[PDB]
Amino acid sequence: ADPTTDESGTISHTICDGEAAELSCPAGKVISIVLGNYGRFSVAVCLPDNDIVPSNINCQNHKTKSILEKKCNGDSMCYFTVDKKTFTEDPCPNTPKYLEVKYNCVVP
């Protein structure tokens, strides 16, 4: 889906498995990853087109926030593909996963 910013200026982003992820900050600022999780925390988000409701909504990859901060922080824009290759592990096999990333844009 589209990145959404709340009242405190934190931009969130929800990107499905196998898709391209683009984080971007305006001129003069750099990305600051607040949160990061690659897995499944919702039944409704990124529905499989096969009509199989996901039964695993307590799926967590704890290395996600640390791998996103070493990849996107200090940079004004970040690119990668969301799959099990980028986050080093499959936190719940046979469950559709997605990266949910929230980030702040701070002056370097």
Considering the complex, state which of residue 14 and residue 32 has its C-beta at the smaller distance from another protein. 14
Query: With CB under 8 A, what is the number of residues at the site for another protein?
Result: 17
* Interface region with another protein, contact rule CB under 8 A, candidates 16-24, 25-33, 53-61, 63-71: 53-61
Each residue 71-100 as x (binds another protein by CB under 8 A) or -, in order, gives: -----------------------------x
DSSP 30: E
Tokens of 13: 């982003």
Considering the complex, state which of residue 58 and residue 94 has its C-beta at the smaller distance from another protein. 58
Binding status of residue 41 toward another protein by CB under 8 A: yes
d(CA 102, CA 26): 16
Binding status of residue 47 toward another protein by CB under 8 A: yes
Query: Which is it for the CA torsion 25, 29, 30, 34, positive or negative?
Result: negative
d(CA 25, CA 16): 21
Closest CA to 103 of 11, 8, 4: 11
Residues in region 13-32 near another protein by CB under 8 A: 14
